[PDB]
Amino acid sequence: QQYECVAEIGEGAYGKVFKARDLKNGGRFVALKRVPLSTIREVAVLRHLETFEHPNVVRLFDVCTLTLVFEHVDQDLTTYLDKVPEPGVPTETIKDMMFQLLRGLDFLHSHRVVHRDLKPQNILVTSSGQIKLADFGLAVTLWYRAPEVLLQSSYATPVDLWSVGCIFAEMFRRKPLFRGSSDVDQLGKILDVIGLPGEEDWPRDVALPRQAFHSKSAQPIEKFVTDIDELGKDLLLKCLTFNPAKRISAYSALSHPYFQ
Template identity: 55%
Template sequence: MAQSERGRNDSGDHQYEEVSLIGKGAYGVVYKGRDLKNEGQYVAMKLIRIQNTEEGMPMSAIREISLLKQLEAYEHPNIVRLLDVRHTPVLSGEIQLKLVFEFIDQDLTTYLEKCPPPGLGPDRIKDLMYQLISGVDFLHSNRIIHRDLKPQNVLISSDGQLKLADFGLARVYGFQMALTQVVVTLWYRAPEVILQAQYATPVDMWSCGCIFAELFNRRPLLCGESDIDQLIKIFE
């Protein structure tokens, strides 16, 4: 599925060149890319489409992106850096957003898969959890609930630094759509989210607990195949 290393640039954006496809999901498409105006350094580019309005980009999306850019000023060590935001019209009713992030080549799932037996030691688990909670605390302190914490959204740099990704974007591209199409997300989802009840910051702590168990077991703790099955496994 990966594109050639020659890259391509179909969007008319002459700063960022697509190198290879990282993944597709309910949220959109993510590419590994190069920043041609910054010595060709690698970046991660998330392309998402949002519904346009008669007045242009929805205010909710503008507010969300503005908040993300404000948070970037803090340069928190456990939050992936948002480097740039671009937007282009796609269809009359849609706008494509290109969110450019620092590139980190592995997530927590890959990190655990590469970990040799017998697995992570207690000190390493403690360090990872400290970094995870530090990042979550920063988001909560700025009134952001991640709502989709899972190993695929937890990145690990080559020097062992943990960074949260995909936070604060849920309202931009419609969280209900994201909730229904990716089963794996169920495994880290708090009961109140599954039951579509009111929820707040504790849902992220539930996800952290699921990740904590996975660091020890090297496999997910609660692997439901549907909303109902997930609730049954939680109650059991």
């Protein structure tokens, strides 16, 4: 066999993911995920995106015929944040890591692919300090979920920029912003901070009415994220817009004055 399983990374959600040895290619570490026609189209898309070899998405090495073979990265964002020396992440490091993130996201959005579960645990940091995206394109924590996903209203690309706002905040605080035990609790936490949207912004034909949430004003963001720039504040707000339509795009965000 070309691969020897040595460890189980974890997840176990869609399937069991193993860290192995690529015996045929110099014993480099790889990540394996052993897993109808809707799945066959899911992998065709991954193989297709590998052709452009974007630097800010994890590399897909092979598809054995069913196991998927990715490069292994030893580290994720949470572990980087765990082990970052106090006072924490230099603001210039935040800017670049973010820039790498939106570049990966724009690449995916451009080819009409949504991550749908963008969290710090499937954001990889290579030894070279490069950002790589993982665990997307194949069908527990709600802390990074867009309001539309929670409300079961829309599941479009704006969802992934909501998650980016959440992560952007977490790079200063080094603690998650919205920690909900459930979808409604999650929704509660969000509206405590960003405030109650207008009725025109609340999607129609949805279980949860705007009237299940009370006294929600609009807390200034500096209170939750300190040592944040004016330009960073501007960008964070356009990402954490309640209405997916009024929310900024990855392409549009890559041009924001914050990055200059």
